């Protein structure tokens, strides 16, 4: 990376440290992911307006560097700055639509993100929002990485129940959780452990059974001993979101991965009949 000048450290993940850096050859400002030591090469071709562009992939001396286009802020920071007032519905709708477009795209190419969450959604002054840090199906764990409370909050139930070969539906679930959070200004299922996460989901949506989710009782980590919670009134979940929004959210949160709405179909939902592209006011 002799052609890269580090500007400042942005953060640390479980297996990689991220830096804001400058490309001496292009003058370009980028984000660098340093991982201590093929599927990645395919990501370099997964180009979309709503996917953070992977500019370069460099493997040198037991070190793997991923060079990404730089964006100044993530959705998490923006929501916090908008906690007092709340992100205007038009903008929430625009962000949801754009991400659904991004997912419709990657899913059509058989690529799953696997770890959607506010901090993995980057935004710019142009009103765009992009999917970042796509996850694989490796490297030396960063010893100094600090635990993050939001880590499991967006995990689909099939992952928590031990599904080994989950589908693109996991991303829809995660996005649905993010949608709910933008609307209510509070995480939907803030669990701090896998079982707590599962039970928080169960408490709201009801403990799944063969009726609503065929095959759920045969899943790896399913336990007949799970407490039985009855699904609560859905109007209680994201007030004061309108029925178009609640309807879409309910379809994004279906327990059965096969019944959960696809990104492609979601784009056609009535909720987006009046979708527009507002300009957010960002403080950088
Ligand atoms: C979340 O995105 C990533 C996650 C892991 C990783 F290894 C990465 F390289 C990225 C990544 O591509 C990436 C990370 N950060 C940034 N810019 C930061 C600047 C600070 N804002 S802030 C705190 O002011 O809101 C948050 C976004 N731009 C990027 N392009």
From Swiss-Prot:
InterPro entries: CDK (IPR050108), Kinase-like_dom_sf (IPR011009), Prot_kinase_dom (IPR000719), Protein_kinase_ATP_BS (IPR017441), Ser/Thr_kinase_AS (IPR008271)
Modified residues (N-acetylmethionine): 1
Ligand binding (Mg(2+)): 120, 133
Similarity remark: Belongs to the protein kinase superfamily. CMGC Ser/Thr protein kinase family. CDC2/CDKX subfamily.
Disulfide bridge map: none
Main enzyme class: transferase
Notes on activation and inhibition: Phosphorylation at Thr-14 or Tyr-15 inactivates the enzyme, while phosphorylation at Thr-146 activates it.
Posttranslational mods: Phosphorylated at Thr-146 by CDK7 in a CAK complex. Phosphorylation at Thr-146 promotes kinase activity, whereas phosphorylation at Tyr-15 by WEE1 reduces slightly kinase activity. Phosphorylated on Thr-14 and Tyr-15 during S and G2 phases before being dephosphorylated by CDC25A. Nitrosylated after treatment with nitric oxide (DETA-NO).
Pfam families associated with the record: Pkinase
Listed EC numbers: 2.7.11.22
Catalytic activity of the protein: L-seryl-[protein] + ATP = O-phospho-L-seryl-[protein] + ADP + H(+); L-threonyl-[protein] + ATP = O-phospho-L-threonyl-[protein] + ADP + H(+)
Site (CDK7 binding): 9, 76-77, 152
Modified residues (Phosphothreonine): 14, 146
GO BP term, pick one: chromatin remodeling
Modified residues (Phosphotyrosine): 15, 19
Descriptive protein name: Cyclin-dependent kinase 2
A GO MF label: cyclin binding
């Amino acid at each position: 990376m002799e052609n890269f000048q580090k500007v400042e450290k942005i953060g640390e993940g479980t297996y990689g440290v991220v830096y804001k850096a400058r490309n001496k050859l292009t003058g370009e400002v980028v984000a660098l992911k340093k991982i201590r030591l093929r599927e990645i090469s395919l990501l370099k071709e997964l180009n979309h307006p709503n996917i953070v562009k992977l500019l370069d992939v460099i493997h040198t001396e037991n070190k793997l560097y991923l060079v990404f286009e730089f964006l100044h802020q993530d959705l998490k920071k923006f929501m916090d700055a908008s906690a007092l007032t709340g992100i205007p519905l038009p903008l929430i709708k625009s962000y949801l639509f754009q991400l659904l477009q991004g997912l419709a795209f990657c899913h059509s190419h058989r690529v799953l993100h696997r770890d959607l969450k506010p901090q993995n959604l980057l935004i710019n002054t142009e009103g765009a929002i992009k999917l970042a840090d796509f996850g694989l199906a490796f490297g030396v764990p960063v010893r100094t990485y600090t635990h993050e409370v939001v880590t499991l909050w967006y995990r689909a139930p099939e992952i928590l129940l031990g599904c080994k070969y989950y589908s693109t539906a996991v991303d829809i679930w995660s996005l649905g959780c993010i949608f709910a959070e933008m609307v209510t200004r509070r995480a939907l299922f803030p669990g701090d452990s896998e079982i707590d996460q599962l039970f928080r989901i169960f408490r709201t949506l009801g403990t799944p059974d063969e009726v609503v989710w065929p095959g759920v009782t045969s899943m790896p980590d399913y336990k007949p001993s799970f407490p039985k919670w009855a699904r609560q009134d859905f109007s209680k979940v994201v007030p004061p979101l309108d029925e178009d929004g609640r309807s879409l959210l309910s379809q994004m949160l279906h327990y059965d991965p096969n019944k959960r709405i696809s990104a492609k179909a979601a784009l056609a939902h009535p909720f987006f009949q009046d979708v527009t592209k507002p300009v957010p006011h960002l403080r950088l």
